[PDB]
Enzyme design. Sequence first.
Site, PDB file in Angstrom:
ATOM      1  CE  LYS B 111     -20.019 -41.666  -0.051  1.00 16.84           C
ATOM      2  NZ  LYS B 111     -20.794 -41.288  -1.370  1.00 16.84           N
TER       3      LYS B 111
HETATM    4  C1  DMA Z   1     -13.791 -39.416  -5.607  1.00 21.28           C
HETATM    5  C2  DMA Z   1     -14.196 -38.677  -4.504  1.00 21.28           C
HETATM    6  C3  DMA Z   1     -12.783 -38.055  -3.613  1.00 21.28           C
HETATM    7  C4  DMA Z   1     -15.374 -38.228  -3.980  1.00 21.28           C
HETATM    8  C5  DMA Z   1     -15.685 -37.348  -2.778  1.00 21.28           C
HETATM    9  O1  DMA Z   1     -16.202 -38.173  -1.795  1.00 21.28           O
HETATM   10  P1  DMA Z   1     -17.528 -37.927  -0.757  1.00 21.28           P
HETATM   11  O2  DMA Z   1     -18.712 -37.513  -1.654  1.00 21.28           O
HETATM   12  O3  DMA Z   1     -17.430 -38.971   0.133  1.00 21.28           O
HETATM   13  O4  DMA Z   1     -16.926 -36.614   0.028  1.00 21.28           O
HETATM   14  P2  DMA Z   1     -17.576 -35.045  -0.157  1.00 21.28           P
HETATM   15  O5  DMA Z   1     -19.036 -35.271   0.083  1.00 21.28           O
HETATM   16  O6  DMA Z   1     -16.912 -34.154   1.023  1.00 21.28           O
HETATM   17  O7  DMA Z   1     -17.008 -34.585  -1.631  1.00 21.28           O
END
Ligand code: DMA
Lengths: 404, 315
Positions: B111
């Site tokens: 991530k």
């Molecule tokens: C690049 C970006 C902001 C990705 C989202 O992160 P995540 O998958 O940890 O969070 P969510 O599941 O809320 O999209």
Amino acid sequence: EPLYSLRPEHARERLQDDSVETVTSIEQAKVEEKIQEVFSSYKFNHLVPRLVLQREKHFHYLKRGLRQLTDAYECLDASRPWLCYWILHSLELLDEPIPQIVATDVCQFLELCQSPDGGFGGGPGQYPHLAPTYAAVNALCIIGTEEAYNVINREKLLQYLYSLKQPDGSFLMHVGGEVDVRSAYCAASVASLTNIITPDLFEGTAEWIARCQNWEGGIGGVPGMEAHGGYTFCGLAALVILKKERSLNLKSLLQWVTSRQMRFEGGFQGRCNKLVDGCYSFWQAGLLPLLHRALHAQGDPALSMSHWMFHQQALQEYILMCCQCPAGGLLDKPGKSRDFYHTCYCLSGLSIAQHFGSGAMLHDVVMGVPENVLQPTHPVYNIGPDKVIQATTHFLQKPVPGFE
Amino acid sequence: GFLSLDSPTYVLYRDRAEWADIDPVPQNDGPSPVVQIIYSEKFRDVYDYFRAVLQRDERSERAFKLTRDAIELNAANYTVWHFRRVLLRSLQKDLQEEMNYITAIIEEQPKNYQVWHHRRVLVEWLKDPSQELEFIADILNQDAKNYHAWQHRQWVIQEFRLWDNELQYVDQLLKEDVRNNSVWNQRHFVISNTTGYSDRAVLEREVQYTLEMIKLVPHNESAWNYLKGILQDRGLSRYPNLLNQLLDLQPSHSSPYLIAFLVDIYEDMLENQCDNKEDILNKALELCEILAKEKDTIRKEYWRYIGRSLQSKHS
Ligand code: DMA
Ligand SMILES: Cc1nn(C)c(C)c1C(=O)N1CCN(Cc2nc3ccccc3n2CC(C)(C)C)CC1
Ligand SMILES: [Mg+2]
Ligand SMILES: [Zn+2]
């Protein structure tokens, strides 16, 4: 009965997996079981639900963090202007004063983060980047003293923004970096607050942002990508600054963001079929005051004169019952660890949920004790509206910089 | 020689013989520090030596190895990543060995933004996308919704024209999890950039496929949103059989998504001079009330706004 999340009919909002289990439904059911345990705790312990924002615990956590952090924060060594912003904005929302000596110390530190060729880096001597540039300018506007405004080298900030501007309208996040919607919002935010917008600085930017709106109605980080709350906030907030909101399909965007509120949890998810998370209380809910303003400008006669187009009560109940850490600070969801990022955006989202304003109409919804009421936040910049007027007023007394 | 940051025999740079000539450069946080991180000895040591090589611009093999430790301590330090890429080109480092390195650190921190941007630069430099679809499929096998991994996948496919097998990969992941919205987005991304949705046989195939997924999992919002998204361009009222086919699935596969889609159809019908306007408006307002008061109360303000909007446009 006063709490929407505790009513007996609320049990009907639990996930219906259609007897088809996949990783998505298994994880969603796990969160709902944990959230239901939190909502049921009052009935189980035989207490009246008393929704209290733990201001004192939040303040202690914030005032310590503003000065010093343990080695657990080594991952934020290139995000120190973000820590200044998250903490000062949380303190501002909590109506906690910033002592004059502490404010001066923040100014002096952000001066060390400023690059000689414009913009700010994630720490002293680090290369400039649009994300810590956005955070540092917001932090200095929250302080709002002549000393804080004078930290910004406006001439070099303008030169720096031009060095990142691409012919297609987009902006790199940093030199030799990449493009995404956040960069356009970072640039529009700092450029409007400091009065450095030249006639062609944002040439093509609104059209490039519009290419990021997809089939879902929301906006992705770049064209082709899945709609996501953080990028959608950045996209729409940048278009509001540029006065180009009509570049988007606002009705498909409105239907998408309202669909991101979780029927059971009350909080918001960042993307369709993903989990609830406290920080999206700001990124998603913050879009509805922006859409209300955009639709009001077009003369929409069907808008509410008292509420935003999301369940303000259910969002406040999710933040107050599920996102507070007992030791101070706020979080994504129960079971997660506190951090200054979630403390900033849970409180910003709570303040959006409490305060409706449009034209001459003002209406507050303060769930729990009346002491829970926070200071208002501006939905474009996510700093106090008074600080936005004060900074814009100050920099409008200076000419737009020229070129070297 | 090499020493991994997490190896048990790792020693601080201030205790390494091959670093005795350079003085570490401490971080200047000011006399009254704010948001001051009390770094561990190991972190402070690497970064004091990193600041030393960066200030003198030492383009050496030892500086290159030092950037690996500085990245592993904080992979979000984009200043360290910039200097590592300067050293990769100045020293003529084997970029396949760097691809092996970036593969390992992305597996560890999938991530982080910086690691994915570095991988894109290496792929651009080598002009070689041959390992990318397989590597990304391995990351997606661990987290099928990783936003950076899908972004890198779309970039590789657009930049190198690797469109031929992506619809098959999309079909595989929809079988694994039909609720994965990132894969419904990838489906739209592949079709819109290859055949397009203006082709009638493709649009018919896509709507028939989506309706079958809705019948199997009626409360999966992603399939409903994809059905809506591919038909909303021309306008939902341009497909007259859609209304009766959704009303047929209502008594056994109903949901707030089906009812909301009926309101969306009626909204577009009212905007395009439909037959029996008063009847269509009364049906739309009746569904807005049912959604606001019972079937979708979390969106009560949205449904009340839609109801007031329909009345306003008719009056
Ligand atoms: C690049 C970006 C902001 C990705 C989202 O992160 P995540 O998958 O940890 O969070 P969510 O599941 O809320 O999209
Ligand atoms: C926390 C954290 N933990 N670590 C280890 C790091 C490196 C951090 C950090 O420094 N962050 C978190 C990610 N955001 C990305 C981002 N930039 C933005 C610029 C303007 C507006 C919003 C922005 N958003 C947030 C999203 C739109 C993506 C929701 C920058 C700040
Ligand atoms: Mg970068
Ligand atoms: Zn979050």
